């Protein structure tokens, strides 16, 4: 849907029909047991705490 939103701001001819069907999340891929993951976790938590 974010691709569609990326379309719509330069495409006023079409319109988005209803909301999201499901709850699907894009996350950052770190290696298994990489030590800086909780740094990223507290970072995104404070950053969207800063919105």
């Amino acid at each position: 849907s974010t691709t569609i939103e990326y379309i719509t701001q330069r495409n006023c001819n079409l319109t988005q029909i209803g909301g999201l069907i499901d709850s699907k999340g894009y996350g950052i891929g770190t290696p298994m047991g990489s030590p800086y993951r909780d740094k990223i976790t507290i970072a995104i938590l404070q950053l969207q705490e800063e919105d």
Partner: protein, 50 residues
């Protein structure tokens, strides 16, 4: 206490937070707001519902 858990100004959490900090339970089954600072309190899994 009847709470999710509330930190004191000195830092004294109550509730299921310090329950799982004092390790007296094994888990905390509650509709918990996963805050920015509750992750610093205890480790999380993924939220069951958003």
């Amino acid at each position: 206490d009847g709470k999710y858990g509330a930190q004191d100004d000195k830092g004294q959490w109550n509730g299921m937070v310090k329950e799982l900090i004092d390790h007296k339970a094994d888990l905390a089954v509650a509709p918990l707001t996963i805050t920015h600072v509750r992750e610093k309190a205890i480790d999380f899994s993924k939220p069951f519902m958003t």
